[PDB]
């Protein structure tokens, strides 16, 4: 069998190369169905020139869900309707993605496939809440979340499903972004937080140079002893107070790519509330109909231009 590979040869500029799939493999062979753009991805789509020529040509989109088409060891029947977990460490962007059994996670079976695209978001969000010992954190708890974004509102949503009786404060930018989280306490600027303001756990999902910021903010303003989540990727070094860190006693976890546990656990909350598939569809910005190369161009550079939530890419390739 053949399969069409869409990598990038040059930024902003799509090809298409070919290499054969055994159907007949321990691995189980998915057409990708809906597909969701990353940050990361749109790094490579736009632009070191030497790290950017060393994996110069790849398949980019890793977040994902799919149909079986094929699993010749007989686990997933024909058509089941999976979402596709990517290596800790190819790309989406194909006709077959082959998986290990273990990396391939079956969705229910009336479910909006378009909004589970970008389920490596909620992992991502779950796995950090996670690295707080359960154990520590009761609904009696006060959260803090900064960055009014795609993180920030998984972060917010989880937290409430799953703490319902804990306080949520959120911290960011823009009134726009803001007014999208309507199941917290309360909601903030950050340049408009008042004296008095505290909680003792808290989570970073701004990223690169605002990190810093957000970092120096919450070190600030955190109950003494509280614990923080770091999700946030600087690809840079940012300036911190460690002075703060010692003289308050605090905890900071560095939290990043999840594993195969992490996407069972999230598939899992879908069944149990799904309250959360309603208020992630709120995520859900334009969705783009990929039929031809033309297609995937018009649809970076949509998701450049984007303002808030994620960009679906409906692969009908
Ligand atoms: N740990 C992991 O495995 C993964 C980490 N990430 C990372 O998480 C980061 C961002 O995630 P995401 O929400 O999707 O990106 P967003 O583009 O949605 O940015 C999040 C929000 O934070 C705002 N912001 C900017 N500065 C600050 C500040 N000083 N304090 C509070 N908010 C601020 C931004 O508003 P404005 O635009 O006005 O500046 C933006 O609205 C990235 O670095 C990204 O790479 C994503 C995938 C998985």
Redesign the pocket.
Known sequence: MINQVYQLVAPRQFEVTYNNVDIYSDYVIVRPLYMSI???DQRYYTGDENVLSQKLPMSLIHEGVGEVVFDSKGVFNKGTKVVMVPNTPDGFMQDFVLLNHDRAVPLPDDIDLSIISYT??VT?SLH?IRRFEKKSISNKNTFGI????????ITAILLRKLYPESKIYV????DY?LSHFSFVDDVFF?NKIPEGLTFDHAFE????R??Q??IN?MIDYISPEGSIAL?????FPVEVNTRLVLEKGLTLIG????GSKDFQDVVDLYIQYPDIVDKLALLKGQEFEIATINDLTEAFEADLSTSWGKTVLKWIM
């Open positions: 990353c940050a990361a490596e978001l991502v950090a900064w960055g009014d974004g795609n993180l920030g509102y911290f960011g930018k823009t972004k950050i999902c701004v990223g690169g605002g990190s910021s957000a903010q999700l946030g990727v600087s690809e939290s990043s790519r999840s």
